[PDB]
Structure 1
Amino acid sequence: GSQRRQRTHFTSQQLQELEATFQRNRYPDMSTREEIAVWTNLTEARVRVWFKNRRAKWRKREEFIVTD
Structure 2
Amino acid sequence: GSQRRQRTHFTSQQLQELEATFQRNHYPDMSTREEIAVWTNLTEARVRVWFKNRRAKWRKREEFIVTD
TM-score normalized with structure 2 length: 0.71
Residue 25 of structure 1 deviates from its aligned partner by 1.1
1:11 and 1:4 mapped to 2: Cα distance? Answer: 13
Residue 55 of structure 1 deviates from its aligned partner by 0.2
Q: Closer, same or farther in 2 for the Cα pair 1:16/1:5, shift >3 Å? A: closer
Give the unaligned 5+ runs of structure 2: none
Segments ≥4 residues shifted beyond 3 Å: 1-7, 60-68
Larger helix share, 1 or 2? 1
Q: Closer, same or farther in 2 for the Cα pair 1:36/1:63, shift >3 Å? A: closer
TM-score normalized with structure 1 length: 0.71
The sequence identity of aligned pairs, in percent, is 99
Give the unaligned 5+ runs of structure 1: none
Q: Closer, same or farther in 2 for the Cα pair 1:5/1:17, shift >3 Å? A: closer
Does 1-10 or 39-48 show the bigger shift? 1-10
Q: How many residues align?
A: 68
The root-mean-square deviation of aligned C-alpha atoms, in Å, is 4.1
1:52 and 1:14 mapped to 2: Cα distance? Answer: 16
